[model samples]
Target: NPIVENANCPDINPIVAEYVLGNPTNVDAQLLDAVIFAFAEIDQSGNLFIPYPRFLNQLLALKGEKPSLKVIVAIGGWGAEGFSDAALTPTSRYNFARQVNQMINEYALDGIDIDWEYPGSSASGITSRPQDRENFTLLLTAIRDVIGDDKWLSVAGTGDRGYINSSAEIDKIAPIIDYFNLMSYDFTAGETGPNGRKHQANLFDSDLSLPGYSVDAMVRNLENAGMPSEKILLGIPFYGRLGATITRTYDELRRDYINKNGYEYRFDNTAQVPYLVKDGDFAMSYDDALSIFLKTQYVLRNCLGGVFSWTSTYDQANILARTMSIGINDPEVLKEELEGIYGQF
Candidate 1:
């Protein structure tokens, strides 16, 4: 009976960062409770291998900086496949779990974070099966059985109804995992609205957005679907989406776009986020210091587990990361900082 129903929340909410390879920026280990390495991949044979072997050395170095920081390796990405076959049968599941244990032991990892995009959906061009719904649970159970209860076991799930009703069995999976990290951004990427532009990761559903396409909506949806509020981590992106193909990191936005190059910064009080409008058309949607502060407030207000960002690499100056840390750990400082920057939010 390793599953603890409604586990108690931590004393202080954690700040998790997804660290991708090839980022020269060193992580501020003290600001993070856990660092999930971008990816390890699953092969056609269901064996796991580190695509970026150097990530292991980086993980060890980060751990040396903060021994208490949990370092977990994420498996699968946007189009990284092989999950359906791996979770298809008892033998496959056993072998996959054994490989997972071996990796954890070999790298001295703190835990594993399964980023299986969407279990039953092949929209990302991965192999998916109708049986993925049930097999997904069994696969996690096998991994949990091998990894034991002392280690962290978590999943990154898409924040949408399709994901809840069709791609995953949320109620069944909720009980076995430590936490659910919601990919709350990219709600309306490359999509058009009545205003000729849209918010990629608005905090709330706005007239510019389809109903339920928001971070708050996703949180409530997961809660109603049986995920505990304290076990949900709200995700924020360190980058901005302009159109279908155009994207920019927060660092780039600050340097080239925000209130510069003819881009006007406008805050949507309705959605509680900021957007860029140029030439009287919505240009880009992204999270700035103010929006990140608002989201952190939302997390604390709702008693969520904590917050996580997509990749620390996109955060060159650590502006958004520091804002998140201060908002969660030191509110008064955050308020003053915000006031100094925006005059008033």
Candidate 2:
């Protein structure tokens, strides 16, 4: 049981598989270190969704099976609003904080991860104010005060240059949060820039990477902005993006294209990413075992906290997920972890 304790493997990057609210019962406790149940929204009254039916019960089952695994509930998501209004005033902040604490105790979760898409911008159909920047820090401070120091807290961060600059309160908010999950993909999506062709989640600064949107640049910017590298977790997508449009899952890409004509597996040497360019007109840049391997290695090389995938539902055959687990662990100690799924990919 102590064989792979997170503290024991400080150098080993963690793999956070975020499970959406419904059916993805295939989470392997041995392969992953933690889990974040996808979402629990805040209503107009600043109250959380009652840990109700499916989400809570399924999560309870996971807690029973893998009691040692770190399981947290995620708050806010794309187009899920109310953060700005809920976090603006003290009474609202108190109500939100109370709900967060209530959820943790009710659901028996390890902690909470806040995924407000961007604090100062109303881009994601959410309310926003210039004061939201500083209020964002206040909200986190309020949550930390109510939740106490023992519980973990994290945020879903953006890679957009303008978004990050406008919401420069991360340095103030960083102390309260346990880590920052950088949503490195979707480089030019949302309120960012033109929908140009590019790798949604490239690992390095490549020829195709625009001015400052590569994964490497994102990390550098966050760190330069004063985020601790040890507290930064790079987010890897289990699916692919096509110009802000959701394309195929990683499994779907392989299923429909592996050996087809106009389909060839290609690697970007500088970007350290793998893509499938079909008929020279379409591209679905997604992380496979190999690219994920490099990204995990990059986490270690840069002293990052770890990697967290968008959702576990996209995983098929557990090849990509297993590769991520194997890649992040120590080969000397985790050789068996790798061997458990050897040659399957």
Candidate 3:
């Protein structure tokens, strides 16, 4: 439902530099088919904007490298809306379904991803009624008409149950989409907490006695809801979270090319995220190499859809790229090697 709301939102920047270009250099080429292209933003017309020709070229370039590499354009993210329009109303649904088919044919993408953000919820300022559950199925069915039986289509769902009540209709979509990508990130976004442990996506709040929604729970929910394990994907966050939103002088801050730790250097088990905050009110929970590695392991155990991260730009030197290689190729040894390399600083 990426119906544009504002006149300016630079979501495309990350998608272009990180997602599109980063692919050739970042993701394991051997696992190219597993990655999906996620881009959603508002346009000048305020009518859900997608970088058309440019985006098409991005996928084309990837195919040029490895024709087998599958690319998917995700519509509707955290704040964008319009899915209900695509689902409930006949005109909007037809137009959106047509665009989906057009994009697939235009880019030869692996498939289309329904990033509705939340079907029953409205985080993206989207409007959804109880009937949305049925309308959503209708939208998928319509898209299926154009997607046909040969292509793959999937949905990115919140790690929640109430919203995905539409999944009961999954019997309709499962046959259409390849699998569902559980957006396993953003356990905490837009928060101001502590240091060395503020906005991590995976872990529970360090102070909390028990863990909250974990990747395991996500898999369980999907499985119980009818989505198979093999068909599930564990979404990883490529960019690490910020430590302290407030600035500290060079002396107070421990900065590295990759991660930033607090003066005290504490980890938040509750958030399953780490940060650095000797003293501050700003909290940030992004992803780092270690975090991604952990999530990847979870994916392996659950047999999810393969590792999918946000945009890749955040990895300037491609730390996650190398970490990914290490995770799959020789994890423990790689860890020791990196420790020696970066251990001094």
Candidate 4:
């Protein structure tokens, strides 16, 4: 109930997607408001560099097709490091932000998305420091100062209790950036031992989930932590997380899994999510047409900024992407589409 209705919600809420390199299909640029290039890393000297330069040409080509689309580069992923050093000092921060500005101008990018997997945590095998909490804000401030007000500045923060409570100072960085992309999926990816199988991207905390490990929980937590609801872009995953290690694309799930090959589909009404069970064990947790429709409804009802997916390549024929777009832009059409797919899920 603490969810503040965003009176300034745009006519079309941003349907952003992260497009990874080496994917067979190019980004469906027309369907998205923005396409975030999966990753560009930070060097030891606080310089930003794309690991796969070959794919940069392909990603850049999309701009010609959709001039209105905002193309952004996401720096630092799961294991990518150097953020601690980059944000260590004002000088380092300035250098890193300058490189970001260079990349923006050189590539004709709309903006940059800083995805420092985490700032104060070394759980991802990245360098960290207690000072990162304050330095994170300073880094963004430097980037904003360099990029100016015309370009977009966003960060992908982990959607967990630790992140909300300690990792980064959300309130301090809130006004310094454009969008706060919450990595809302993978809630149970690190689960092990008993009670490991739970919904990976459920809207609400279910009996299977840890205390505050749902999409709604993260949203509320971020809001309570001083981030406005309109500035938060809720994240969705295009693939299914199987147990703790395995993953499968929506295309693969449609082709072989999903009630096929001894996998039985089950929808959790409480969580508003779908999962697959095999051999009396949880096999996979993913979003289908029904779940996507519900999630979009949640976005609208709560008046959050918008929705974004991890990678667009996992969806076949752009089914999930198209579904997301429709759900955000035209709720009636989304309901019709969902009924056509699952009849009455």
Candidate 5:
């Protein structure tokens, strides 16, 4: 399997201390290719502080073990309140873009991931101006200018049917950035029942209406949208979803969630998502090689650029890296993809 790891690493003041303690020379790249660090609230005072050198040297050491590997910084995640202001003004945009480029060069980063949790349309903390759409494009363009031709740029997008209304504007972004990873796994999880969604994109699905998500839908969305599939990358999660655990029965299990007793499950080709129902007290969601096998099928079927996960840290077996290895590095056509499932046809 070919996979990658992702970490929603908050490189905040206190946490960076832990980062230093935990991060050493012989680190595991499978644990993470890059940690998604944040800095969305820095003001005009230039008071922003970052322990860039320490982290960079540590990351480089990891690369020594695995060349061609990278550690990227993610800017503007959800809850950060400065994107609108910083990105709207030409000066702010230029300055921000310059900062990103500078960070890339200073660290010699392979790329930078702009994880602006949501664009103007989907996020509230972010500025939602008619011009925001244009400004976003400009910010990325400027980033390209700063990094020049050698660096990579990737963006994260929410996957709910209504979460993001249009991809029309995103077309402007595609050319400048290398990949756009679809946040394919949150709408369906232990805490997300109210969303009326059962699963995000999983490896397979038995019922279109079931609580499981499948790769087919993820790919179809881009294909239907006029966004070229080749530039699109799928986002896989290293963590699993949860339902009621400790519940004695299925009905009770469905009511809430429990970490234990709940059946931890793997993706079912029939369901594509991994879900377990042990003792009927819980439902667990996660991904595995078989699950990724299906996702890889989607990438190959559409000839996508590749697959990227939310974070590679959660999988102890380095499943994320393994998935990428199988899909991107090894490259193959899955039997399931060639066979075709009932619902798909």
Candidate 6:
């Protein structure tokens, strides 16, 4: 099956960056690895919004500058869920697929990426069914059939196995999708240790007590869940989790260095991540230049497809995103970093 399947897979693995709609003005071509414009929500009638003008403007700008960079539109975010209703029938799926094709033609855009949170679970306020799981694949297949084989199509994937653990389903949809952008964040873990504390998006499962919650663990699980390694795009976060309460952007977190109010920066070798601690009450981990380079290293070391991020705006000084771009683009740098991943087994 892998033979005819993915025959068109891109030879060079990608570095994807998400651009939340309404905020496309800030991205620069140099910082944009691949622009994924998010959130074209589906209506109850199973129709998609015609691609936004500002989004199209951004796409057009990238035409000559960064010509090879992909420009994709992402549909259905966390609560923006109409997938259950839209994907319920063959007629609805066909009609929706036609609109997507029309949008691509009208804008001369690249492709579509599905960001449905959980297809079968309605926990985040959406209609759903036991049948929604299979219907998810159906909707994608319909879109693939409409778009043909040349266009890029992918999904914003989940790390939780309970929501997405059907190998048969993955097998049916594998060829239809170009890649799976693994949402490898929100692991929520820490302990009483010398490394101070742990946050959600650490590179490795530094805490032995918490099983199956690291990027490494999740990637392995997803692979075993029936997707190919080359079709997986690992994700890195551009934010921080603090005290199980507040969330801060990477730029906001960087201010800790200037103020230095009880916050201490530290690193964990076992986890291969960095964190900040304050008075043992507040503990957090975030992606910085060092941590991101480490994650990109993990990507090359494991032979995974590529790396993507939650967003491009969360970054300040272009530290996190640029580190990823430079690492994946330069073979000498990638090879040196791969050396650090020697004993991941």
Off by over 4 Å in 5: 1-27, 30-57, 121-127, 159-168, 189-197, 203-215, 242-345
Instruction: List TM-scores for all candidates, in order.
Output: 0.71, 0.69, 0.58, 0.72, 0.55, 0.66
Query: What digit string (tens of lDDT, one per residue) describes model 4 on residues 194-235?
Result: 546777887887577766778888888889989877789988
Candidate 1 per-residue C-alpha lDDT over 1-345 given as tens digits, one digit per residue, 9 for 90 to 100: 354343565353656666554552567787778888878998766789987678566666876658898888888878989999999999999999999999999988888999887789888889889989889999999999999999888999875888888777788889889989888887756355353266778887756665668888889889998888878888888898754656798888888876578778888889989998999999999999898899999999999999999878999889899998888998889988777578432
For candidate 2, what is the lDDT?
A: 0.75
Worst 10 residues of 4 by lDDT: 3-12
lDDT of 3 by residue, 1-345 (tens): 465534454332111112342223444445445455656443433244565556445555756667766677777666666776667777767777787887777666767777776676665566767777778777888888888877777787755566446533655566667667777755545344553344445533334212455566666767776775667766766555544343233233336442345444445556655555546653555666656566666677787776655556877778777777666666676667546433231
Tens-place lDDT digits, model 5, residues 150-178 = 77687777544443353225657768887
RMSD per model, one decimal:
15.2, 15.5, 17.7, 15.0, 16.8, 15.4
Q: Residue by residue across 1-345, what tens digits does model 6's lDDT show?
A: 234435476575546576555656666767766777776778766778844667666655776868877788888877786787778899889988998898788767788898877787776687778887889899999999999899989988665677556312676777789888888875542333433245576666654224556777767776877778888888877777543455677778778533386678777888888788887753887876667777887898999999998888887667667778987788567446545554443
* Better by lDDT, candidate 5 or 1: 1
Clashing pairs in 1: none
Better of 1 and 2 by TM-score: 1
| Candidate 2, superposed: residue stretches over 4 Å from native | 1-16, 19-21, 50-52, 190-195, 259-345
* Candidate that would win on TM-score: 4
Residues 78-178 of candidate 2 have per-residue lDDT tens digits of: 88888988878998888889889998888777889998877888777788888877888888888899988888798888755675678757578768898
**TM-score: the better of candidates 3 and 4:** 4
Better structure of 3 and 6 per TM-score: 6
Candidate 1 weakest ten by summed lDDT? 3-12
Candidate 6 or 2, higher lDDT: 2
Q: Residue pairs in steric clash, candidate 4?
A: none
By TM-score, highest first, what's the ranking? Answer: 4, 1, 2, 6, 3, 5
